[PDB]
Design an enzyme around this catalytic site. Structure first.
Site, PDB file in Angstrom:
ATOM      1  N   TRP D  39       0.857  -1.170   0.000  1.00  0.00           N
ATOM      2  CA  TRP D  39       0.000   0.000   0.000  1.00  0.00           C
ATOM      3  C   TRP D  39       0.900   1.229   0.000  1.00  0.00           C
ATOM      4  O   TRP D  39       2.094   1.162   0.353  1.00  0.00           O
ATOM      5  CB  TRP D  39      -0.955   0.031   1.189  1.00  0.00           C
ATOM      6  CG  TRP D  39      -0.309   0.219   2.516  1.00  0.00           C
ATOM      7  CD1 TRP D  39      -0.090   1.404   3.110  1.00  0.00           C
ATOM      8  CD2 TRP D  39       0.200  -0.787   3.424  1.00  0.00           C
ATOM      9  NE1 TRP D  39       0.518   1.237   4.309  1.00  0.00           N
ATOM     10  CE2 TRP D  39       0.707  -0.097   4.537  1.00  0.00           C
ATOM     11  CE3 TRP D  39       0.275  -2.191   3.404  1.00  0.00           C
ATOM     12  CZ2 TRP D  39       1.284  -0.731   5.624  1.00  0.00           C
ATOM     13  CZ3 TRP D  39       0.876  -2.848   4.544  1.00  0.00           C
ATOM     14  CH2 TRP D  39       1.368  -2.090   5.623  1.00  0.00           C
ATOM     15  N   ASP D  58       6.756  -4.127   2.873  1.00  0.00           N
ATOM     16  CA  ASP D  58       7.023  -4.863   4.083  1.00  0.00           C
ATOM     17  C   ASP D  58       8.258  -5.680   3.892  1.00  0.00           C
ATOM     18  O   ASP D  58       8.713  -5.882   2.764  1.00  0.00           O
ATOM     19  CB  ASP D  58       5.840  -5.791   4.398  1.00  0.00           C
ATOM     20  CG  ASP D  58       4.663  -5.044   4.927  1.00  0.00           C
ATOM     21  OD1 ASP D  58       4.866  -3.964   5.520  1.00  0.00           O
ATOM     22  OD2 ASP D  58       3.513  -5.516   4.780  1.00  0.00           O
TER      23      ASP D  58
HETATM   24  N1  LIG Z   1      -0.230  -3.822   7.576  1.00  0.00           N
HETATM   25  C1  LIG Z   1      -0.236  -4.504   8.887  1.00  0.00           C
HETATM   26  C2  LIG Z   1      -0.805  -5.888   9.002  1.00  0.00           C
HETATM   27  C3  LIG Z   1      -0.011  -6.982   8.709  1.00  0.00           C
HETATM   28  C4  LIG Z   1      -0.683  -8.474   8.797  1.00  0.00           C
HETATM   29  C5  LIG Z   1      -2.009  -8.543   9.154  1.00  0.00           C
HETATM   30  N2  LIG Z   1      -2.587  -9.768   9.205  1.00  0.00           N
HETATM   31  O1  LIG Z   1      -3.738  -9.872   9.542  1.00  0.00           O
HETATM   32  O2  LIG Z   1      -1.908 -10.722   8.920  1.00  0.00           O
HETATM   33  C6  LIG Z   1      -2.751  -7.365   9.423  1.00  0.00           C
HETATM   34  C7  LIG Z   1      -2.166  -6.084   9.339  1.00  0.00           C
END
Ligand SMILES: NCc1ccc([N+](=O)[O-])cc1
Ligand SMILES: NCc1ccc([N+](=O)[O-])cc1
Ligand SMILES: NCc1ccc([N+](=O)[O-])cc1
Ligand SMILES: NCc1ccc([N+](=O)[O-])cc1
EC number: 1.4.9.2
Lengths: 122, 357, 358, 109
Positions: D39, D58
């Site tokens: 994003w 990430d």
């Molecule tokens: N962008 C942060 C993030 C990373 C992983 C999850 N998830 O649910 O695996 C949620 C939110």
């Protein structure tokens, strides 16, 4: 005799780490995890093996052999974590030792919670 | 700007320490946190699944982990493994299969060790019957199961020999195992009784010299095993306690609770007052510094609720660890000097280790 | 003297049970469902859900459905995305249903893991990152359909007045309706007119869902509606949640699963906070406002207790709220909710709680 | 500094800053793998008064770093504007999708 039956006691008493039969518990009390002192939470499996403690019952003045069977195959319960070490000994006295996972011989060794089962008089 | 990977740990190896975080509340997500002890910087980590154990290769080039997987974590087939990781890139290289009986337990050093020559990994098994596993590093193979060690516990390598180690047994003595070039047991010996298992049980953590090991007891006594010679000679007890200490019921407590500065023969021990049955794993009220030759205490300093420690010989350093925070001490003089504290190095760690230099 | 036994069932009746989906974000590979008795706060049991689990309870109340991701060596090795079926009463694993390796990994909004009203299909969100909706046939225990028509859309809103129809919110500001056949494949679909301006008045995805219509709140405190009493969805709005006095303090909604509808009364519950501006859409609730959706007017306001997510039980007239770690239980039988109790430490990091169906 | 959640580039981060995890604002910690997708956020640089596109790639394939958890939601939008959305795992397409930490890479105005 009433102090030998945790099912008759107030839940706050039995869920405390200072409850007399929890004297060598290192883990989460199953009684706080949807189980009881002597029954695994739903969907967790009893360990066929355990370490054992001898704990003093201050209510009847007698000493008792307690078997610390774990419940296994689910992830850590996380509640009522207790760490008591009365008469606990190192790994060269293996069945007195609680720094090992007594779920180790279960079909799934994931450690869920620990119970305190009354074997009898010491 | 473009995001890139493939990077190596930023700090020199000599700065690196390894905090083995059990993450007991979520034990399936244990990991090793790598820190720079000089400035407290987080350098990276290695995931170690359920109840990981860790050591660094004697040559400093690799990290070894030991862990357990299941195909669906809480169900499915079990895989006990050793893993080899690059020390600088913190990347996975190789999996070595174990029989499904590696020890699942708190991170005492003696459960996961290696031979002095670095050729074999030596690990503790429990099925619950105990044995010692030997892993050939170069071959990436489990090669020997030392069932002769049944009824014993933990691995104490002998720094004066290339592939020998001892274990503490339920008879109060030590079993020495000497490996052949192939990792099979070539010879073994049993010492005479060192301590009374019932009357004066020892902590398993050795204060390890090049050719002898000292152990402390539940009641504050000290035992020794000397392995300079052909057979292990055993001695003790001598007391860590003077009369005033005894009257206040000072006893040792912790997990990896001792260390030895080899040059000086100073032994470091976590101590607490008001000792009685059940207090052997209590946090340190104090660290006591003993001269192992004169058998006299030479310092006592605040314990900072520490539970485990480790020593670096060359830099004259001690680390202590309270479960979450790491303290760095200068131990070049009898009285240690606190240099710094690394806060939040872990959630539930009972083991810290230096990178070998 | 005593012997430890397993094989036991949940101690409290199904009507007492709630499910707190704990992401355990700090250790997200050990997410889990905590089962609680909402009447007294008693921990009843749990279901492990590996990395970023999602959860729902079968419409019939007999089974718990989870969705998760595994890898052979957790942080390496082959991936397996699955739905698991667990027994509700024994909290034991029964079956795994294989999914293509693109099930959504994200925070626990209800609409990522749902079912058709008839309970025959599990309907989930995929992202590879291109979006599609996956369909699982419960009777077969198989994945049966990728709804690629839903590309550019997000989340699943089941239609309570049809057996196997649901809607999804799309990037054009309208809703796409999918009507499944008895085989779980797309039998028909339709697209609404534009409901909201994506740029000027984005809505929260969480529906306030009635039998035949759904309401949605926006970043700026407006309300949009989608009526599915008929075959084609008719849309409407905005009306504003705010009266003139509210405008001064810049009240705006905030949270995750942040709205709820009490169907018998038409009361919509919404988490709100003052001093709204860009970036406050996930802020904890300063207040809970209660809106009559017929009159388009607020009928009550109470302190929010920093809540982020809610759920409603129609039959018992209850609302749960959740601040990430604690669950509050409210009686909503009257327009002003009454706080009955708080369950402390129900989770470390939960943005979703659900009732057992009764 | 860059380790602060208030650092201007971090305006749509919901995760752990890699700069606290043995990496930097623009590099993954050792043995974690960059995500090829992300994003994106629009953040105001107070130093020059200009707004920039920041890509929040990430680092993946290791378990949660757990340090410098930030949660800022400036111009963040729901899943129907998918590449402005941060409540999903942007490691979702990696060889191993386990989420480790988040980077904040300057793309342009
Ligand atoms: N962008 C942060 C993030 C990373 C992983 C999850 N998830 O649910 O695996 C949620 C939110
Ligand atoms: N008796 C508690 C306990 C359970 C599991 C471990 N372990 O390391 O897996 C250690 C200690
Ligand atoms: N219940 C035993 C125990 C005690 C302390 C730690 N710790 O990390 O400090 C881990 C496990
Ligand atoms: N980083 C976003 C976020 C915020 C609140 C929770 N929670 O559980 O309360 C989880 C995740």
């Amino acid at each position: 005799h009433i102090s030998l039956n945790p099912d008759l006691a107030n839940e706050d008493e039995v869920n405390s780490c200072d409850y007399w039969r929890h004297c060598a518990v290192d883990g989460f009390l199953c009684s706080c995890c949807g189980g009881t002192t002597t029954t695994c939470p739903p969907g967790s499996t009893p360990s066929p093996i355990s370490w054992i403690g001898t704990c003093h019952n201050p209510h009847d003045g007698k000493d008792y052999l307690i078997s610390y069977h774990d419940c296994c195959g689910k992830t850590a319960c996380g509640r009522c974590q207790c760490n008591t070490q009365t008469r606990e000994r190192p790994g060269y006295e293996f069945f007195l030792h609680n720094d090992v996972n007594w779920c180790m011989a279960n079909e799934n060794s994931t450690f869920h919670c620990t119970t305190s089962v009354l074997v009898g008089l010491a | 700007e473009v995001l890139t990977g493939g990077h190596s740990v930023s700090a020199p190896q000599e700065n690196r320490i390894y905090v083995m975080d059990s993450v007991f509340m979520h034990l399936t997500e244990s990991r090793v946190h790598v820190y720079d002890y000089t400035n407290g910087k987080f350098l990276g980590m290695v995931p170690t699944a359920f109840n990981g154990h860790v050591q660094v290769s004697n040559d400093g080039k690799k990290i070894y982990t030991m862990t357990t997987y299941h195909e669906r974590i809480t169900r499915g087939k079990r895989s006990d493994v050793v893993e080899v990781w690059d020390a600088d890139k913190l990347t996975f290289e190789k999996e070595i299969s174990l029989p499904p009986k590696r020890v699942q337990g708190l991170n005492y050093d003696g459960l996961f060790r290696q031979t002095t020559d670095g050729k074999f990994i030596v690990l503790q098994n429990a099925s619950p019957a105990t044995s010692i596993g030997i892993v050939d590093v170069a071959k990436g193979d489990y090669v020997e199961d030392v069932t002769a060690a049944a009824g014993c516990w933990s691995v104490i390598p002998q720094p004066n020999r290339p592939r020998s180690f001892m274990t503490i047994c339920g008879d109060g003595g030590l079993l020495t195992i000497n490996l052949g070039e192939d990792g099979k047991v070539a010879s073994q010996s049993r010492s005479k009784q060192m301590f009374s298992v019932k009357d004066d049980p020892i902590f398993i953590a050795p204060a390890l010299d090049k050719d002898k090991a000292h152990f402390v007891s539940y009641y504050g006594n000290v035992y020794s095993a000397d392995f300079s010679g052909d057979e292990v000679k055993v001695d003790g007890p001598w007391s860590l306690l003077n009369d005033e200490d005894k009257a206040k019921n000072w006893v040792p407590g912790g997990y990896n609770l001792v260390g030895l500065h080899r040059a000086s023969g100073r032994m470091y021990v976590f101590m607490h007052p008001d000792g009685k049955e059940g207090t052997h794993k209590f946090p340190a009220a104090e660290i006591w510094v003993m001269d192992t030759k004169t058998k006299q205490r030479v310092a006592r300093i605040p314990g900072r609720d520490a539970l485990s420690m480790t020593i670096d010989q060359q830099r004259n350093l001690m680390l202590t660890l309270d479960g979450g925070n790491v303290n760095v001490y200068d131990i070049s003089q009898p009285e240690p000097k606190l240099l710094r504290t690394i806060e939040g190095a872990a959630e539930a760690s009972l083991q810290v280790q230096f990178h070998p230099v």
